[PDB]
């Protein structure tokens, strides 16, 4: 194959990073190509609406042989990468990191979208550098959230209702607690350099961990580790998603009750703006 | 306002049965005009694919400043018109109404549809006589069953997936059986005239009623019924959805092995069809 002329007139096309580096011919600035196969719909309507510092935007779109997303090129790579091999983060660069993570989560429930597909791999880093921007990316298993079914249900007399249909009605909306389970299994993973559930060294199956709730605990590990942010990830790592910290109740956790981190932040945050910072009206 | 210019090319227009009669030109024959005012998308996408004698057939549409429908007439009307008040069918019409709804929404699961408000309401009799052709009317609240998310994130390792997710694993694909508890609603009304959950001299909520499944059993209204019909009523109204009866269940319930009741339907399935009957190839 070849890529579509139309990609083609307006970039020059490079290296594997599918995704790959391409050079926007009119700036001559780098930018990320994520091929996928011929979903996309939903994904491309989510991220053309999506507008947060923490949240990667979509600068162009192709529909051809493939599917062709044109992004922000992230310089640091995956979050992945920096926690695979038993490698952890500095307790400082976590909270960092996590603080972001939770302002793109907070941001993405506050308008109605629970991305279902929260991992390092989907976290990407700005730079090479240990404090800098985290993007949340990977929109494709992510999900609307609007009027439902059971509302409208919920409207009409019960006669012919099921009774399961009323028993959900308890649990209803509590979707995007699946999202702050993930951050938690995340924050688990950059603090230990190990993750909670997994079936290296155990007896007991992955699914059974994960519905008991019973994540691996070694001491060792976890002494490096502060009580705070302990106690964040017990609190997101709660089986019941009713009882399950929010990503609001998270972010006013004492753990990110710290000033030099985010200032740190908002350092990072007007550095990157710096370009395109338009006079202001004084 | 006056009906689109289409629909008038085609159709004379008449009296309220909003549904109303009217008469295509072309044959003479009379139809039912189904004006929704300005989720008719997947309606008319259902209808159009679903091909059997207990559901009714769409014949033409129109998308003008509202929907309209044009649909098969039937001239007994609702089922409802003939259970309200207190009124009950003889226990031989039950069957022969019941066996065909039966059959329509073994037809419909079958094809991976789930109606979703089923109730006398949208319950159609074809003729005036006692003995008739039922359809299975208003696929509005329907639901196409497909590839699931679940089956999708079921696929992938589960090291970041939320608990209640893998819980949802043993329930899921019961969805179907929500048509299974209504029509056992609608099989205790048509055999006793009364609903089976109610608010009327009780003290227990209909909420409470239902996720309990504790209907009202009144011993002098059913002791003119028959225990088999009651045990088939007693089996669709189960509380569990994975025990509930399906359709395939119900059918071979002794109630329904009928071979009279059976040759009554297939006798007036024929006088239907003697008019549509192309010559055979002997
Ligand atoms: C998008 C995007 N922007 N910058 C990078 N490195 C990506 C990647 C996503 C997935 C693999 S690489
Ligand atoms: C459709 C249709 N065909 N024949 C009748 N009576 C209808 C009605 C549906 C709802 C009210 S009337
Ligand atoms: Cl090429
Ligand atoms: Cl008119």
């Not at 926690?83 to 429930?109: D, I, P």
Request: hydrophobic residues 40%; proline residues 4%; charged residues 30%.
């Amino acid at each position: 194959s070849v890529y579509p002329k139309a990609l083609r007139d307006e970039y020059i096309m490079s290296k594997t990073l599918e995704v790959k580096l391409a050079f926007e011919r009119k700036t001559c600035k780098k930018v990320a190509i994520k091929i996928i196969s011929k979903n996309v719909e939903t994904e491309i309507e989510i991220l053309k609406k999506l507008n947060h510092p923490c949240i990667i935007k979509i600068k162009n779109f192709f529909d051809a042989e493939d599917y062709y997303i044109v992004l922000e090129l992230m310089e640091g790579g995956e979050l992945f990468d920096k926690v695979v091999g038993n490698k952890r983060l500095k307790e400082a660069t976590c909270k960092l990191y996590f603080y972001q993570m939770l302002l793109a989560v907070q941001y993405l429930h506050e308008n109605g979208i629970i991305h279902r597909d929260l991992k390092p791999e989907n976290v990407l880093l700005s730079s090479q550098e240990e404090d800098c921007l985290i993007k949340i990316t990977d929109f494709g298993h992510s999900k609307i959230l609007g009027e439902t079914s059971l509302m409208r249900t919920l409207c009409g007399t019960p006669t012919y209702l099921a009774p399961e249909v009323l028993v959900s009605v308890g649990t209803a909306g509590y979707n995007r607690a699946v999202d702050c389970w993930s951050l938690g299994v995340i924050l688990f993973i950059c603090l230990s350099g190990y993750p909670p559930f997994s079936e290296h060294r155990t007896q007991v199956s992955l699914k059974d961990q994960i519905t008991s709730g019973k994540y691996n605990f070694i001491p060792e590990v976890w002494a490096e580790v502060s009580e705070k942010a302990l106690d964040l990830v017990k609190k997101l790592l709660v089986v019941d998603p009713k009882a399950r910290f929010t990503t609001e109740e998270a972010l006013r956790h004492p753990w990110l009750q710290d000033e030099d981190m985010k200032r740190k932040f908002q350092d990072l945050l007007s550095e990157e703006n710096e370009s395109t910072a338009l006079p202001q009206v004084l």
